[PDB]
Design an enzyme around this catalytic site. Sequence first.
Site, mmCIF file in Angstrom:
data_model
loop_
_atom_site.group_PDB
_atom_site.id
_atom_site.type_symbol
_atom_site.label_atom_id
_atom_site.label_comp_id
_atom_site.label_asym_id
_atom_site.label_seq_id
_atom_site.Cartn_x
_atom_site.Cartn_y
_atom_site.Cartn_z
ATOM 1 N N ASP B 147 0.869 -1.188 0.000
ATOM 2 C CA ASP B 147 0.000 0.000 0.000
ATOM 3 C C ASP B 147 0.900 1.230 0.000
ATOM 4 O O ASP B 147 1.821 1.309 0.834
ATOM 5 C CB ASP B 147 -0.884 0.007 1.251
ATOM 6 C CG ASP B 147 -1.968 1.106 1.229
ATOM 7 O OD1 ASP B 147 -2.487 1.475 0.147
ATOM 8 O OD2 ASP B 147 -2.306 1.602 2.322
ATOM 9 N N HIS B 220 -9.813 -2.573 -7.355
ATOM 10 C CA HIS B 220 -9.589 -1.382 -6.524
ATOM 11 C C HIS B 220 -8.949 -0.202 -7.267
ATOM 12 O O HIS B 220 -9.430 0.917 -7.156
ATOM 13 C CB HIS B 220 -8.729 -1.708 -5.287
ATOM 14 C CG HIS B 220 -8.694 -0.610 -4.274
ATOM 15 N ND1 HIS B 220 -9.805 0.132 -3.937
ATOM 16 C CD2 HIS B 220 -7.679 -0.129 -3.518
ATOM 17 C CE1 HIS B 220 -9.475 1.025 -3.021
ATOM 18 N NE2 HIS B 220 -8.189 0.888 -2.746
HETATM 19 C C1 HEM Z 1 -9.523 -1.581 2.977
HETATM 20 C C2 HEM Z 1 -9.111 -0.368 2.637
HETATM 21 C C3 HEM Z 1 -8.089 -0.169 1.507
HETATM 22 C C4 HEM Z 1 -7.053 -0.934 1.142
HETATM 23 C C5 HEM Z 1 -6.557 -2.268 1.745
HETATM 24 C C6 HEM Z 1 -6.417 -0.284 0.016
HETATM 25 C C7 HEM Z 1 -5.323 -0.761 -0.636
HETATM 26 C C8 HEM Z 1 -4.759 -0.207 -1.748
HETATM 27 C C9 HEM Z 1 -3.683 -0.793 -2.503
HETATM 28 C C10 HEM Z 1 -3.015 -2.132 -2.150
HETATM 29 C C11 HEM Z 1 -3.393 0.026 -3.530
HETATM 30 C C12 HEM Z 1 -2.310 -0.161 -4.621
HETATM 31 C C13 HEM Z 1 -0.956 0.444 -4.198
HETATM 32 C C14 HEM Z 1 -0.958 1.949 -4.350
HETATM 33 O O1 HEM Z 1 -0.905 2.441 -5.510
HETATM 34 O O2 HEM Z 1 -1.009 2.679 -3.316
HETATM 35 C C15 HEM Z 1 -4.300 1.149 -3.433
HETATM 36 C C16 HEM Z 1 -4.335 2.216 -4.292
HETATM 37 C C17 HEM Z 1 -5.105 3.331 -4.131
HETATM 38 N N1 HEM Z 1 -6.138 3.483 -3.224
HETATM 39 FE FE1 HEM Z 1 -6.719 2.055 -1.841
HETATM 40 N N2 HEM Z 1 -7.088 0.882 -0.280
HETATM 41 C C18 HEM Z 1 -8.118 0.970 0.622
HETATM 42 C C19 HEM Z 1 -9.026 1.967 0.676
HETATM 43 C C20 HEM Z 1 -9.002 3.070 -0.119
HETATM 44 C C21 HEM Z 1 -9.985 4.120 -0.071
HETATM 45 C C22 HEM Z 1 -11.187 4.097 0.886
HETATM 46 C C23 HEM Z 1 -9.636 5.035 -0.980
HETATM 47 C C24 HEM Z 1 -10.344 6.355 -1.341
HETATM 48 C C25 HEM Z 1 -11.483 6.785 -0.783
HETATM 49 C C26 HEM Z 1 -8.416 4.572 -1.613
HETATM 50 C C27 HEM Z 1 -7.739 5.229 -2.596
HETATM 51 C C28 HEM Z 1 -6.698 4.742 -3.336
HETATM 52 C C29 HEM Z 1 -6.016 5.482 -4.364
HETATM 53 C C30 HEM Z 1 -6.321 6.924 -4.824
HETATM 54 C C31 HEM Z 1 -4.952 4.541 -4.896
HETATM 55 C C32 HEM Z 1 -3.926 4.795 -6.012
HETATM 56 C C33 HEM Z 1 -4.494 4.221 -7.300
HETATM 57 C C34 HEM Z 1 -3.720 4.668 -8.519
HETATM 58 O O3 HEM Z 1 -3.870 5.855 -8.910
HETATM 59 O O4 HEM Z 1 -2.962 3.822 -9.086
HETATM 60 N N3 HEM Z 1 -8.047 3.363 -1.064
HETATM 61 N N4 HEM Z 1 -5.126 0.983 -2.336
#
Ligand code: HEM
Lengths: 306, 306
Positions: B147, B220
């Site tokens: 993450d 996601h």
């Molecule tokens: C259980 C809760 C969550 C988990 C386990 C999770 C996990 C992840 C993971 C593994 C990634 C890919 C690695 C990265 O690019 O950072 C990611 C990307 C991302 N997540 Fe989540 N996330 C969660 C909740 C959220 C929520 C609630 C939001 C927004 C309201 C969010 C917004 C984003 C964004 C903006 C990215 C980058 C995507 C990109 O532009 O490539 N995440 N998240």
Amino acid sequence: NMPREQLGVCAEGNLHSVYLMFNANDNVESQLRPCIANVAQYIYELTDQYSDSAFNGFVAIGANYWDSLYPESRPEMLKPFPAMQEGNREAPAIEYDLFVHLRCDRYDILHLVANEISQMFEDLVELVEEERGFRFMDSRDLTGFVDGTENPKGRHRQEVALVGSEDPEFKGGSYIHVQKYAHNLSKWHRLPLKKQEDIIGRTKQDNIEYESEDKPLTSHIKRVNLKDENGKSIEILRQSMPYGSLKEQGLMFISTCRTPDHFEKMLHSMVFGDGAGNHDHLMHFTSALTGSSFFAPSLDFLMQFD
Amino acid sequence: NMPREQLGVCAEGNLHSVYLMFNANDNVESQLRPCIANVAQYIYELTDQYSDSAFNGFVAIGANYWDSLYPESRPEMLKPFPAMQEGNREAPAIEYDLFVHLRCDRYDILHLVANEISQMFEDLVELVEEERGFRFMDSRDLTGFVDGTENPKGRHRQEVALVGSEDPEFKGGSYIHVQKYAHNLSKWHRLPLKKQEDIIGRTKQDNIEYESEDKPLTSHIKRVNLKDENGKSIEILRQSMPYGSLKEQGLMFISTCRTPDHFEKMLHSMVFGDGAGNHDHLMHFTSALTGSSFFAPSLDFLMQFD
Ligand code: HEM
Ligand code: HEM
Ligand code: NA
Ligand code: NA
């Protein structure tokens, strides 16, 4: 010396720890006994796997549940926590069927291992208490005084902690007692420095033991340094760590010893005092919320089953 | 650029963190406002004091309490958590008056600082929630996936996170949203590897982003990578960390942004999906137990009081 002690009993200190108390469901002893074997083994094996972060651990078994799990044989001296109380100085007994004591310089690895161990128990036991310990500063209790200094060292640790040929069947095992101490930190920290030092019997910062003649009869170190009926020192190996959070915080007191009366004699001397009514004034500043007796056998004892 | 942003808003990652939610007693705003100033300042000063362990932190203020504390003026876009729900995919709103976000590579120092900050608030507020975050492995969520990867980097972080001259009075401040996500790890870990990877849109171990054409519409990363009405990327700076224990564990999701609708648009896209009913299947595996909107002002704004 065929039995192998569990490695976490005498382990040197660590930055972090997890403490898990489980109570067993009804009539599950046939299934738990071998499952405990797998867990004990895993915990041992993890010492090598996670040597990089000094991992170590043990599984111990409650005094009041030993005979449901191991009805054929018993550690010679095993018994419940020795409840005692005088005035506001209360040492209650609250026993648990199983205790899993886990340690490491990495917290993420303990989280992982705990999760894993929980899954190993299946639906045979319930998790009742979980707490996380941490090193505070240079191995200090949250009182700001260094905890550990007069513990047995090197091979003396084994000598103090582990049962030997006095009880052949259980050689490699240790008698364990756990007290969750909730400190009243606001009350403590209003004490002038000299008072604090007078309560423990050592200087705070430099941690210099008072001279004999200067140790007050009500000081922690005066009260818990005892000698037997022949003059010899009566020792334990403590493995305690700070624990908790804003809601509640103090010391997770853990004693490990080849005999259970060492901790008891110390605790009596703390609660009831010397006989001219000199008790341990440290007890005016923290409260023992739990009191549990366990036996942590050798790996080899735990493994002889299914 | 006279206002100074609080240092913990854009800070690089840390091994540990503490999250403290406080609700204020009745009619205490006259006394709290300057007390918040002292706390904000202390937290800033501690960055230098504890540089050795990369300490950093911020104090933020709940959307529904801003006007009791700061009635004369307001961040342009400030509003409550944007509650939403479809099927089992629930994002509830549960607001708190004050949030203290603390971070460090040493846990003992956070324990100390938290204790200290709690004493700073006197009897003006009640502690309502406390949780402790931790880095898991090489910055992974407890799902086992990395993450953080596509977060803004270097100076872009400031660009994304901090209010600028669109709202002169509050330049240096950030819009903050917090969701405590409780993962169902047993359910997750029964998924074959390819399914896990298909839900996130990246490979697990090597963390390799899928090609566009290969990203499933329910993944996601497909769902939360959005572009505005002009094609430009809509970003946030996340500061989330794993949290919890056996009883309950998941991700403490934290969004930081110069505008609050970025997080909202993402969350809508996750819950409600793309419009042909392609929602975020990650939501089948974790549940958001809380949902809080805050504003973390610049230090300078907080300090102009008594
Ligand atoms: C259980 C809760 C969550 C988990 C386990 C999770 C996990 C992840 C993971 C593994 C990634 C890919 C690695 C990265 O690019 O950072 C990611 C990307 C991302 N997540 Fe989540 N996330 C969660 C909740 C959220 C929520 C609630 C939001 C927004 C309201 C969010 C917004 C984003 C964004 C903006 C990215 C980058 C995507 C990109 O532009 O490539 N995440 N998240
Ligand atoms: C609030 C709980 C306790 C705190 C904060 C505490 C703290 C300390 C400190 C600061 C020392 C001096 C440093 C050292 O030599 O290790 C010490 C010594 C010691 N404590 Fe405690 N202790 C606590 C409870 C207990 C209990 C319950 C026992 C036994 C039942 C115990 C047994 C001992 C022993 C045997 C020593 C070594 C004394 C010596 O021989 O010099 N402690 N403790
Ligand atoms: Na295993
Ligand atoms: Na201070």
